[PDB]
Each structure stands twice: as structure tokens, then as C-alpha cells.
């Protein structure tokens, strides 16, 4: 079925919300200082979740579960922002809008379950270039809509993914990342690297083999060419609030 059973999504939202409640509170208390109090600003946050099958339990990966737990933690932390709109995108071979910036807030468990229903981790490819093109285009039109009646609007994309893309795409992503920075869209990549998955299977130790002109294999660390300027490694959910707050504190604000 293209959707999770709605009942399963409700149970997941409720379980995750309880599991992450203290972590959400810590993140929101830090976000309050970074983003509030102290202009009349507005915030638009797109949570972009990897729906590719590399994420999936059928691939013996825990990345999908950790991403949905992280989604609930972050979405719940963000709902404390008065002037914030939260939207959700799913991506693999194509990109879908799971929750629009204009849609009802995540103060409701039914709204959260409707989002979780759409993530099944079955797509056959991970097209990060298309994800970035769609995200920039989405924010550009939101910026145009903003014109209607005076807004200091700040736009943030948080990508929740195992970070496994074809090495060739690392180069193709760089022009799109420049375009995002030129348009002042901050892009943070949140790498799902669940430490309990298995002994000795972290993305930090993922290597890649290339055959040279002589035919001799040469081996490099996969992450050495990872292009994203702001990224976090999530080994345990407990890692996420402080690291995400630190990056935003420093580089969303600056």
C-alpha cells in the first residue's frame, strides 16, 4: 500500500512524541533565544525527508525510523515559533509536498500522523539534485507570496536522510547549493547514522573504490566529497537538539 495504515501512523506519532518530548523541549528552549525576543521576523522551515528504499528496514537500515523520530522531535520543537510556518517534503525518485507551509500546524496528532502516513521508504532512487531544485523553487514562490501586506522572512531547509547519493551527484549539487546561499536559503543536512544499527557500520567509515587509468583500485572516504556546507551526524536522537541549535545559533543568525 502506498500509505501506511493510518492507525499505525497514529501509534508512531504518539510513541515518537513521548520518546522525544524532553529532547524537543531542549531544542525549543534554545530556538527561543536564537529566533525570538530580543525584530518582527517570519520563519519558513521545510523538513525534507528521504523516502528512498536505502532508508528502509527491508534494506536492514534503521535510517527511516530515525528520520521519522527526528521529524516528530523537530516539528514539535518548532511549533513554539509564533511567526513560523512548517512544511514537509518527501523525496526519492520524485519530490512530494507532504504538508504545505500554509497547512494546519503540528499541534494535532492527526496532522502529524497524516504526514507519517506518506513515508514508506520504497522509492528506487535518491535524486538529491531534484530535491534541491524543488526546494529552491518552493521557497522562491513563497518569497513572492510574502510580498502581500512587510516581512523579514528567513527560510530554512532541513534534510533528513542517510546521506547516500551517487558520488557523481556530489559535484552536480554544488551549483544548486550556491544558488540556495545566494537566495539566502540556509540548507542543513541531518545525516541519519543510527549507532545501534550494527557494530561497525557508520557512514563515517564508508569508503568508495575507483579504478585508476592504470587499473589499480584507489579507495577514498565517501564523505570527503560530500558537498553540503552545514551538516550534522545523528548517532542517537540525543545528538540532535544541541547540534542543530549550535549550527543555527552560529550561522542562521550571524
Amino acid at each position: 500500500r502506498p500509505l501506511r495504515d493510518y492507525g499505525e501512523a497514529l501509534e508512531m506519532w504518539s510513541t515518537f512524541q513521548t520518546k522525544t518530548q524532553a529532547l524537543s523541549q531542549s531544542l525549543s528552549s534554545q530556538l527561543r533565544l536564537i529566533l525570538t525576543g530580543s525584530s518582527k521576523r517570519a520563519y519558513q522551515i521545510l523538513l525534507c525527508v528521504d523516502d528512498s528504499s536505502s532508508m528502509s528496514d527491508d534494506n536492514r537500515s534503521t535510517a527511516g525510523n530515525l528520520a521519522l523520530e527526528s521529524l516528530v522531535m523537530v516539528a514539535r520543537a518548532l511549533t513554539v515559533l509564533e511567526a513560523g510556518q512548517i512544511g514537509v517534503m518527501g523525496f526519492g525518485t520524485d519530490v512530494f509536498v507532504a504538508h504545505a507551509l500554509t497547512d494546519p500546524p503540528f499541534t494535532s496528532q492527526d496532522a502529524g500522523a497524516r504526514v507519517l502516513q506518506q513515508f514508506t521508504f520504497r522509492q528506487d532512487s535518491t535524486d538529491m539534485v531534484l530535491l534541491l531544485r524543488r526546494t529552491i523553487d518552493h521557497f522562491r514562490e513563497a518569497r513572492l507570496i510574502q510580498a502581500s501586506s512587510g516581512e523579514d522572512l528567513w527560510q530554512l531547509a532541513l534534510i533528513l536522510s542517510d546521506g547516500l547519493v551517487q558520488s557523481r551527484d556530489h559535484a552536480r549539487l554544488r551549483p544548486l547549493l550556491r544558488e540556495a546561499m545566494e537566495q539566502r536559503v540556509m540548507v542543513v543536512f541531518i545525516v541519519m547514522d543510527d549507532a545501534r544499527s550494527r557494530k561497525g557500520h557508520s557512514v563515517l567509515e564508508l569508503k568508495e573504490a575507483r579504478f585508476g587509468p592504470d587499473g589499480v583500485p584507489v579507495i577514498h572516504r565517501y564523505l570527503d566529497s560530500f558537498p553540503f556546507p552545514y551538516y550534522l551526524i545523528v548517532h542517537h536522537l540525543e545528538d540532535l537538539p544541541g547540534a542543530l541549535a549550535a549550527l543555527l545559533r552560529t550561522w542562521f543568525a550571524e
Binding site: S53, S54, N59, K199, P217
Partner: protein, 87 residues
């Protein structure tokens, strides 16, 4: 130049890799001949020229990895566990 993610494992005593070298992205069109060269290479086992065979879930690899995926209805998103055995 598509890549497939593989995890090497072995049940033979003297031929284990350090945990840090077992997970590798490899060209999708590679066959056992090329995988054996990688394993023998300086950054891996550094054993020079031992011919290795590879089992995937108890069955020997007889094609390229991409044809193995296609034959089993799998995409390039799949991680393959390759058990290496002396030929």
C-alpha cells in the same frame, strides 16, 4: 559510473578486514574478478593476488552486481552483503 553499496564479510580466520574497511561503494558493473582485485589491494587485505569468490545470501555471484540486482528485482538503493571465500 553508477555505484552499488557493498559490505564485505568472511568466515575464514586469517582474512578479516578491519571494521573500518568493510563497507564500500563500488562501480555497479563490477564482477567477481574486479571485486577480488579490490580485496587484494594495498588499502584492503594487501594479499596481492588470491582469487576470491563471493556469496550473496548463500549463493555464488556469477554476474555483475547490477545484473544481480536486476535479476532479483532490486534497485541501486540496496546494500549487498558479499561474503568472500578463497577460490
Amino acid at each position: 559510473v553508477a555505484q552499488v553499496k557493498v559490505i564485505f564479510t568472511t568466515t575464514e580466520p586469517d582474512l578479516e578486514l578491519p571494521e573500518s574497511k568493510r563497507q564500500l561503494l563500488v562501480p555497479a558493473d563490477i564482477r567477481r574478478y574486479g571485486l577480488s582485485r579490490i580485496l587484494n589491494s594495498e588499502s584492503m587485505l594487501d594479499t596481492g593476488s588470491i582469487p576470491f569468490d563471493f556469496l550473496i545470501n548463500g549463493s555464488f555471484l556469477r554476474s555483475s552486481l547490477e545484473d544481480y540486482l536486476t535479476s532479483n528485482g532490486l534497485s541501486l538503493e540496496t546494500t549487498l552483503t558479499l561474503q568472500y571465500v578463497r577460490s
